[PDB]
């Protein structure tokens, strides 16, 4: 069913899947109600989260996290983990003895919700700070924009 | 190769005026060169100049006067905050009366006095005394 | 100065300030374009097309009379080679020197010139792949040289 790929039954804790309904409603349509919310800072909840079917407890829009604290950006560099990506933040650090700059970088592991598809290497991602979700992830993807050179 | 055409223009002007010439030809032209020469002109240092238009980067003929001792570029264009001007002038201008740090600010090309007056900083281009 | 020759010449072409088409040229832009078309059908590179148009047909600059330069004219109707003419000439020169090396093994000067030509080929191929004229998989191989000619 492309949903129950685990050894426990995956469901959204807030929605109830065992409502007692009539035969006409049974023959009408078999669509579950879906829990979603807004990451309310001028961030639009995507349609793939509202109309989707996936289950992710660490998703900003459908899971159990809240976005509070910093909001940063990065470029996607690696996408080889399961529901998390590794992004890169480049910056310039000012050495004031020389009055010059050196280029520095920080690698950041962020949680990518399944509602963001067609995320490529090099696309600009906007992440927001949440509570600790694993040992090394603290930020959660909220927006994706493509690279300006790509059509 | 030829980078920083403002540096080459200022070096040409300085070298020509130290040989006691009346006019100097500089190529190629640039809008930064023209604004720098306008900044010199409004302070009465290089007379008046004229831009020659070929369909390439143009040339400039400058009528030298003699009041200039040295004009120079500060490469690279260092970030100059509004405090650093005193430090920068105590590094660059040999006295408190004459000499000019030219800044490219968000309000355009100006000298350090007009930079102070409009209350802004920018990036340093050059100085002339 | 040149890239690898230490000499620094000046000889080039000096375009006049007059961009307007001169009055004596009775040829229109269209007739110039079909001249380009027959010239390309004769198996001519764009440089040779411009040279013949300047020498015989009186066209001072194709870009001044037609509004576009010759490669764009050949690209509009698809009469353009897959790879550009400078890369093609470097590759032909490399094949010629390599065949001479196959006949003559004591020519170390031809070996050094071959290294120089291949270096030009690599730099210009890097430039073209940056601007998408060549596909990203394109590579110059010494054995994959006579097949491109």
């Amino acid at each position: 069913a492309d949903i129950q790929t685990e050894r426990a039954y995956q469901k959204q804790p807030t929605i109830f899947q065992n409502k007692k309904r009539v035969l006409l409603g049974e023959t009408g349509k078999e669509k579950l109600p879906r829990y979603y919310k807004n990451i309310g800072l001028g961030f639009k909840t995507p349609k793939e989260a509202i109309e989707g079917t996936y289950i992710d407890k660490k998703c900003p829009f459908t899971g159990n996290v809240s976005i509070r604290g910093r909001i940063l950006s990065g470029v996607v560099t690696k996408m080889k983990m399961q529901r998390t990506i590794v992004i890169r933040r480049d910056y310039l650090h000012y050495i004031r003895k020389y009055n010059r700059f050196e280029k520095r970088h920080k690698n950041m592991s962020v949680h990518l919700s399944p509602c963001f598809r067609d995320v490529q290497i090099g696309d600009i991602v906007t992440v927001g700070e949440c509570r600790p979700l694993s040992k090394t992830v603290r930020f959660n993807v909220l927006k994706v924009t493509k690279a300006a050179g790509t059509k | 190769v030829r980078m920083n055409v403002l540096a080459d223009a200022l070096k040409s002007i300085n070298n020509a005026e130290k040989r006691g010439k009346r006019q100097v030809l500089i190529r190629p032209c640039s809008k930064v060169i023209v604004r720098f020469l306008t900044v010199m002109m409004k302070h009465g240092y290089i007379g008046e100049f004229e831009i020659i238009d070929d369909h390439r980067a143009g040339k400039i003929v400058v009528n030298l006067t003699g009041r200039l001792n040295k004009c120079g570029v500060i490469s690279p264009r260092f970030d100059v905050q509004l405090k650093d001007l005193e430090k920068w002038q105590n590094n660059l201008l040999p006295s408190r009366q004459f000499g000019f740090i030219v800044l490219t600010t968000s309000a355009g090309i100006m000298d350090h006095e007009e930079a102070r007056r409009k209350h802004t900083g920018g990036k340093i281009l050059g100085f002339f005394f | 100065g040149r890239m690898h020759a230490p000499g620094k010449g000046l000889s080039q072409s000096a375009l006049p300030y007059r961009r307007s088409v001169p009055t004596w040229l009775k040829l229109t832009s269209d007739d110039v374009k079909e001249q380009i078309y027959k010239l390309a059908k004769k198996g001519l590179t764009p440089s040779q097309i411009g040279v013949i148009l300047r020498d015989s047909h009186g066209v001072a600059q194709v870009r001044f009379v037609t509004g576009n330069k010759i490669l764009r004219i050949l690209k509009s109707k698809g009469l353009a080679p897959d790879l550009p003419e400078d890369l093609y000439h470097l590759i032909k020169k490399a094949v010629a020197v390599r065949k001479h090396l196959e006949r003559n093994r004591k020519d170390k000067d031809a070996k050094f010139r071959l290294i120089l030509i291949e270096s030009r080929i690599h730099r210009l191929a890097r430039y073209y792949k940056t601007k998408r004229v060549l596909p990203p998989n394109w590579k110059y191989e010494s054995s994959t040289a006579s097949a491109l000619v």
Partner: protein
Amino acid sequence: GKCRGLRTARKLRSHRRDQKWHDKQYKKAHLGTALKANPFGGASHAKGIVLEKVGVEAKQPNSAIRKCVRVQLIKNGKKITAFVPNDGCLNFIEENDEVLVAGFGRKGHAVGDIPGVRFKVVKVANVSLLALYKGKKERPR
């Protein structure tokens, strides 16, 4: 020529770091081998036990015979040779006296007159040689 690029701070720092390592005062003060090999252990004075009394010959253009003490330092057991201001002051010094010793005065360098001595005797038996030589104090035994 040197680079002046606005994004070259890291290269400037790395080069200055290596070229500071080529500076001999920097290398002495930061490598550390100068303080491990110093008989004083990096201190200003040192106490020792006088082992013997010797005579070191002076330099060639000013020929003389200076008299020195061979003394083993207490805190590390190193042997050094120490200078006495004159031969009158040497009569206050006996074998097995605790002696406080300083450097000669040119900061680790030897004498321009006596070859190969760098230390001078300051105190013996917890009284200074100046106080003994001027009759201000006497020393015990």
